[PDB]
Design a protein around this ligand. Structure first.
Ligand SMILES: Cc1cc2nc3c(=O)[nH]c(=O)nc-3n(C[C@H](O)[C@H](O)[C@H](O)COP(=O)(O)O)c2cc1C
Ligand code: SF4
Ligand code: SF4
Ligand code: SF4
Ligand code: FES
Ligand code: FES
Ligand SMILES: [K+]
Lengths: 44, 263, 430, 213
C-alpha cells in the first residue's frame, strides 16, 4: 500500500567510521581504467 | 604575422597572442604596479595591485595574469584604475607594522615606493593590527614575518627556481602564514635570492642587518669570481667599505640570481 | 501567459522524495520514474540533450544563476586528447542553504542519473561529486546508490546499454565553505588548499587535473534527467520568462515551521513564507527583514518583502539576488546589526586568505561591524565601511569577497538609522 | 589554534604512526579514483583516513601521508592546516560541534551552547578532564531549517532544546549511541505539524514523458 507517514531513510543510523571508505573499496571493481598524464607526477 | 593590435591609453601596440595586459603596457614604457608578479616566477595574481581598467569593461582585470584581446584599450591612468590601486594599497597597509625606521628595507622598499606613487597619503584604519611570530630558516635570511604581505614570491621561487618545496602557507584567511610549519632551515645554494625577491622587509640578510641604508651606498658593477660562471654583481660600498653583494641582471649568464657563496 | 506563479502541484514537482517518506534506494527511485528511458536519452545525442536544457531555460542553482544550457555547451567540442570531466558541486556551504542535502540523501538516484545525462551532454568520461565532509551520512547514502547503479548496469561500462562509459566518483571535503567556489572546488579535488583560480583559463578549457571540466550544482544536475524526459518546454512553462522552472526553497529563521519545500519560480515571497512555513513568528507584521538567497545576498526590509517575487530578475530589481533561494526570516525581536555582524564573522572565518582585498578587507570589516554592534563608533564610520566594502567588491579573485561586501551594503542601505541610533546610545553612556 | 608546529614528546616526527594493513587496502582504492600522474589528489581523503584510524593528526601522520603519495611534506602541512575538520591536537572521544551562524543563532543556539557548558563544566574550546568531550563552535553545517543543531563525530542532532542536548550527553556518557536527526516531532526537513506538499502518491515511470522519448 501507499504510506506517506514514516521515515524511510533509517539505514544511516547503522553507519560507522569506515562505511564510506568501505563502500569506495567495493566500487573499485566496477571502475574503468584511469587515464594517464604520461608520468608518475609533475615532478618526474 | 599573428601579432594582434591592442591600445594602451589609446596608443596602438602590436603584441603576440598570449601577451598579458601587464606585458602590453611594458611595450609602450608603462610599468604597471605589482607585488606578487615576478617575470621569472609563475603567475600568481593574488596581490591585486596590478588591477587596471579595460575601456568599456565594467570590471577591472588583473593585468599580470589577463591575456590581451584584440582591440582592447588599457586605461593605465583612469580614475577607475587609480581608485583600485588606492584600495589595494590601503588593504596592504592595514595590518602592516610601523617598522620603517627599524626595517632594513627602508629606502629600497616597493611597498614604501608604490604607496608614495599609487596609494593614498593617510590612513583610516582605526583597529589593532595583526602580529605574527618569526621563524628561523637558517643563518642567512632573517624573517620578520609581521612585515610579510603574503605575496608568495618566496614560495614560488623556492619551488620553481631552487627546486625546494619547503616553503608554503599555513592557516587561512587573515591568519594565513608563510613559513615551513615545522622548524626547518632553508639552506639551498640559491637561498639568498629570496631576500631580493621579497618586496618587503619580511626577508632580509642577516649579515647585512642594520649596517647601511640604500641611498648612501655606491654601486660598483662587477663580476663574481667565486666560481667560473661569471655572475654579474653589484658591489655596494659606503665610505670606503664593502657593505653587500647584489645580483646584476645578465640574461645569458645568471639572469638576476647569484649563489649564496657569491652573495 | 501566466501572470501569477506558485501553487505548484505534486504532479509537476521534480524531487518527489524531498522528505524521505518513500524509499531512497534504487527500488523506490525506479518506481518514481528515475532511470526510465535513460538509454533513449543517451542515444539521442549530446546536442539534443543540450537543446532540451537550453529550451528549458534552466539557470544555475548554485548561486550565480548562469543559463545552464549555454554553460554546458562549452564542453560540446572535439576532444584534443585529454579526458573530460563533470564535477558536481555538493559542498552546500552557504548559510541558510540545506536544499542540496535533501537531494543527496533522499533522492540520490536523480543525482546519479543527472551525472550520466549531464555527463553525456558534455562528452565526459566521469563525474566527481564533491560533497562537504560534514555530510558524512549523506555521502554514505550516495555511495550506496552509486553501487546500486553500478550493479544494475546503469553506470560504468556500457551504461544503461548505451555503449557509453561513465564513472561516478564521490570525494569528500574537509571543512571549508570556500571549496564550494567552482575553481576552489577543483583545486581541492587535486589535493591542494581550497584556493580559487583566476580566470581565464576557464574550467571548460583547463579544469580538474588540467582537463576540460564543467562544475554544476547538485540541483542543476539532478533536475536535468527529468527535463529531458518531460521536455524543456514543460519546464519552461513555470516561472516568469528567463526565470523558468521549479526551485527548492529553504525557509529558516523566525518562521513558525522552518522547512524545505519545492515551489514554482517567481512565487511571491510573502506567499512562500505563509503557505509553506506557517507565517512569520508573531504574525506577518512582526517581520523585520529577510535574506532571500543565503547569506551572500543583501537583506530587504518588510516593505520590499510585501510584494517581491522569488526569481533572479525580480530580486535583482529589489537590490539583492535569488542566490541559493534560502530565505532567512528575521522578526522585529532580532538585533539586526548583530545578525549581520555574525555573517561577516562567518566570511572572516571562511576567507581563503589568498588575495588582498578579502584577506585584509573582510577581517577589517569584521572588526568595524563588531564595534557597530555595541555602537562604539562614530556615524562618519558608516560611510567609511560602505567605501571599504566597495574596495573589496569586484577586486578579489573569487566571489566570496563580493558575498561579504553585499550583506554589509544591504544593512547600511536599509538600516542606517539603527546604526546611528545605536552609536548615540553608546556615546551617552560615555 | 596555532598554525606552526613545535616538536613535543607526544607530537614529534618520531611519534609512532602507521596505517593498518586494512587501511592500506582502503588507501589503494582511494588512489585509483584519480588519473595516473595525479596521486596528489588523494591527499585530502588519505589524510582524513589517518585521522579516522588515529583520532587526530600528529606530525608523523602528516609525514606518513606525504611519503605514501610521494608528495612534499609541506604540501601535506598546507592541507592539514587549511581545512578545519583535521585535528592537529588530540580531541575528546566525542567532538561536539555547535553551529552558531546566524540562522542557528536566530533559533537560540546560544541556549544549546549554554546547556552543554553547564552539563560538562567546560568552556568552548576545551576538553573534559576525562577526555570524553571536546566542545567548539562551528559555521553553518547545512542543516539550517533544522536549527538549532549540533554535530557529534559523524552525526547531526537537530531541532534541539536545552533538555534534548543534556539527554544526548547523558546517553553518550553511559555509552549508548543516540539516534541522529531531529529531536522534535518531525523526521527531517518537513514542515512541522503537517506536510504542505508531496501529499499525493508519487507518479510512476513514464509519467508526462514527451513524445519521442
Ligand atoms: C564562496 C562561494 C561558495 C560557493 N558555494 C557553492 C556551493 O556550496 N554549491 C554550489 O553549487 N555553488 C557554490 N558556489 C557557486 C559556484 O562557484 C558555481 O557558481 C556553481 O557551482 C556553478 O553551478 P551552477 O551552474 O549549477 O550554478 C559558491 C561560490 C562562492 C563564491
Ligand atoms: S617593508 Fe617597507 S613599508 Fe614595511 S616597514 Fe619595511 S620599509 Fe616600511
Ligand atoms: S615573505 Fe616576502 S616574498 Fe614571501 S610571501 Fe611574504 S612578502 Fe612575499
Ligand atoms: S576573495 Fe577571499 S576567498 Fe576568494 S580568493 Fe580572495 S581571499 Fe580567497
Ligand atoms: S601583480 Fe597582479 S595580482 Fe599581484
Ligand atoms: S546556520 Fe546552523 S546549520 Fe546553517
Ligand atoms: K626584501
Amino acid at each position: 500500500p501507499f504510506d506517506n507517514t514514516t521515515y524511510k531513510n533509517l539505514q544511516h543510523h547503522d553507519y560507522s567510521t569506515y562505511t564510506f571508505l568501505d563502500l569506495n573499496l567495493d566500487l573499485s571493481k566496477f571502475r574503468m581504467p584511469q587515464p594517464s598524464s604520461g608520468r608518475e607526477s609533475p615532478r618526474h | 604575422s599573428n601579432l594582434i593590435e591592442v591600445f594602451v591609453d589609446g596608443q596602438s601596440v602590436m603584441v603576440e597572442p598570449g601577451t598579458t595586459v601587464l606585458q602590453a603596457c611594458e611595450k609602450v614604457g608603462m610599468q604597471i604596479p605589482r607585488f606578487c608578479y615576478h617575470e621569472r616566477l609563475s603567475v600568481a595574481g593574488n596581490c591585486r595591485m596590478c588591477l587596471v581598467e579595460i575601456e568599456k569593461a565594467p570590471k577591472v582585470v588583473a593585468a599580470c595574469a589577463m591575456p590581451v584581446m584584440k582591440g582592447w584599450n588599457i586605461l593605465t591612468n583612469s580614475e577607475k584604475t587609480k581608485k583600485a590601486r588606492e584600495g589595494v594599497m590601503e588593504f596592504l597597509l592595514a595590518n602592516h607594522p610601523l617598522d620603517c625606521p627599524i626595517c632594513d628595507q627602508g629606502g629600497e622598499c616597493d611597498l614604501q615606493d608604490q604607496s608614495m606613487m599609487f596609494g593614498s597619503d593617510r590612513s583610516r584604519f582605526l583597529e589593532g593590527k595583526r602580529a605574527v611570530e618569526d621563524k628561523n630558516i637558517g643563518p642567512l635570511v632573517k624573517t620578520i614575518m609581521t612585515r610579510c604581505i603574503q605575496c608568495t614570491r618566496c614560495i614560488r621561487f623556492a619551488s620553481e627556481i631552487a627546486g625546494v618545496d619547503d616553503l608554503g602557507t599555513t592557516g587561512r584567511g587573515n591568519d594565513m602564514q608563510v613559513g615551513t610549519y615545522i622548524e626547518k632551515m632553508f639552506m639551498s645554494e640559491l637561498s639568498g635570492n629570496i631576500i631580493d625577491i621579497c618586496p618587503v622587509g619580511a626577508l632580509t640578510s642577516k649579515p647585512y642587518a642594520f649596517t647601511a641604508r640604500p641611498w648612501e651606498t655606491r654601486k660598483t658593477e662587477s663580476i663574481d669570481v667565486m666560481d667560473a660562471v661569471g655572475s654579474n654583481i653589484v658591489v655596494s660600498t659606503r665610505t670606503g667599505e664593502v657593505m653587500r653583494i647584489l645580483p646584476r641582471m645578465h640574461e645569458d649568464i645568471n639572469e638576476e640570481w647569484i649563489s649564496d657563496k657569491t652573495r | 501567459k501566466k501572470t501569477s506563479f506558485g501553487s505548484l502541484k505534486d504532479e509537476d514537482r521534480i524531487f518527489t522524495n524531498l522528505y524521505g517518506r518513500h524509499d531512497w534506494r534504487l527500488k523506490g527511485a525506479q518506481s518514481r520514474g528515475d532511470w526510465y528511458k535513460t538509454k533513449e536519452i543517451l542515444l539521442k545525442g549530446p546536442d539534443w540533450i543540450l537543446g532540451e536544457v537550453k529550451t528549458s531555460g534552466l539557470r544555475g542553482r548554485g548561486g550565480a544563476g548562469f543559463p545552464t544550457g549555454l554553460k554546458w555547451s562549452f564542453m560540446n567540442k572535439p576532444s584534443d586528447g585529454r579526458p573530460k570531466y563533470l564535477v558536481v558541486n555538493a559542498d552546500e556551504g552557504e548559510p541558510g542553504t540545506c536544499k542540496d542535502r535533501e537531494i543527496i540523501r533522499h533522492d540520490p538516484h536523480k543525482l546519479v542519473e543527472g551525472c550520466l545525462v549531464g555527463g553525456r551532454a558534455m562528452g565526459a568520461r566521469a563525474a566527481y561529486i564533491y560533497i562537504r565532509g560534514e555530510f558524512y551520512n549523506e555521502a554514505s547514502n550516495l555511495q550506496v546508490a552509486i553501487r546500486e547503479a553500478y550493479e544494475a548496469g546503469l553506470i560504468g561500462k556500457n551504461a544503461c546499454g548505451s555503449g557509453y562509459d561513465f564513472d561516478v566518483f564521490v570525494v569528500r571535503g574537509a571543512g571549508a565553505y570556500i571549496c564550494g567556489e567552482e575553481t576552489a572546488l577543483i583545486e581541492s579535488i587535486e589535493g591542494k588548499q581550497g584556493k580559487p583560480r583566476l580566470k581565464p583559463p576557464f574550467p571548460a578549457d583547463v579544469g580538474v587535473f588540467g582537463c576540460p571540466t564543467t562544475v554544476a550544482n547538485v540541483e542543476t544536475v539532478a533536475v536535468s534527467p527529468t527535463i529531458c524526459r518531460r521536455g524543456g518546454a514543460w519546464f519552461a512553462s513555470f516561472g516568469r520568462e528567463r526565470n523558468s522552472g521549479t526551485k527548492l526553497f529553504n525557509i529558516s529563521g523566525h518562521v513558525n515551521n522552518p522547512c524545505t519545500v519545492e515551489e514554482e519560480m517567481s512565487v511571491p515571497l510573502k506567499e512562500l513564507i505563509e503557505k509553506h512555513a506557517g507565517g512569520v513568528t508573531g504574525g506577518w507584521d512582526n517581520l523585520l527583514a529577510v535574506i532571500p538567497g543565503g547569506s551572500s545576498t543583501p537583506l530587504i526590509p518588510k516593505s520590499v518583502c510585501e510584494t517581491v517575487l522569488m526569481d533572479f530578475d525580480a530580486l535583482i530589481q529589489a537590490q539583492t539576488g535569488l542566490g541559493t533561494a534560502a530565505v532567512i526570516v528575521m522578526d522585529r525581536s532580532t538585533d539586526i546589526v548583530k545578525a549581520i555582524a555574525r555573517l561577516i564573522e562567518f566570511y572572516k572565518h571562511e576567507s581563503c586568505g589568498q588575495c588582498t582585498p578579502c584577506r585584509e578587507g573582510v577581517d577589517w570589516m569584521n572588526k568595524v561591524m563588531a564595534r557597530f554592534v555595541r555602537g562604539d563608533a562614530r556615524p562618519a564610520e558608516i560611510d567609511s565601511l560602505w567605501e571599504i566594502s566597495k574596495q573589496i567588491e569586484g577586486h578579489t579573485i573569487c566571489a566570496l569577497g563580493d558575498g561579504a561586501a553585499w550583506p554589509v551594503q544591504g544593512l547600511i542601505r536599509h538600516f542606517r538609522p539603527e546604526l546611528e541610533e545605536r552609536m548615540q546610545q553608546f556615546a551617552q553612556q560615555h | 589554534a596555532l598554525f606552526v608546529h613545535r616538536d613535543t614528546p607526544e607530537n614529534n616526527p618520531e611519534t609512532p604512526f602507521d596505517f593498518t594493513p586494512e587501511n592500506y587496502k582502503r588507501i589503494e582504492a582511494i588512489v585509483k579514483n584519480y588519473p595516473e600522474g595525479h596521486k596528489a589528489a588523494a591527499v585530502l581523503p588519505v589524510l582524513d583516513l589517518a585521522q579516522r584510524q588515529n583520532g587526530w593528526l600528529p606530525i608523523s601522520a602528516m609525514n606518513k601521508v606525504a611519503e605514501i603519495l610521494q608528495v612534499p611534506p609541506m604540501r601535506v602541512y598546507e592541507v592539514a592546516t587549511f581545512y578545519t575538520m583535521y585535528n592537529r591536537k588530540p580531541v575528546g572521544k566525542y567532538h561536539i560541534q555547535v553551529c552558531t551562524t546566524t540562522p542557528c543563532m536566530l533559533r537560540n543556539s546560544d541556549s544549546i551552547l549554554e546547556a552543554i557548558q553547564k552539563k560538562l563544566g567546560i568552556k568552548v574550546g576545551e576538553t573534559t578532564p576525562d577526555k570524553l568531550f571536546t566542545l567548539i563552535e562551528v559555521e553553518c553545517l547545512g542543516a539550517c531549517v533544522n536549527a538549532p543543531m549540533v554535530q557529534i563525530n559523524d552525526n547531526y542532532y537537530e531541532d534541539l532544546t536545552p533538555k534534548d542536548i543534556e539527554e544526548i550527553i547523558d546517553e553518550l556518557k553511559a555509552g549508548k549511541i543516540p539516534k541522529p536527526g531531529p529531536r522534535s516531532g518531525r523526521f527531517s526537513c518537513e514542515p512541522a505539524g503537517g506536510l504542505t506538499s508531496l501529499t499525493e502518491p508519487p507518479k510512476g515511470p513514464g509519467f508526462g514523458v514527451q513524445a519521442g522519448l
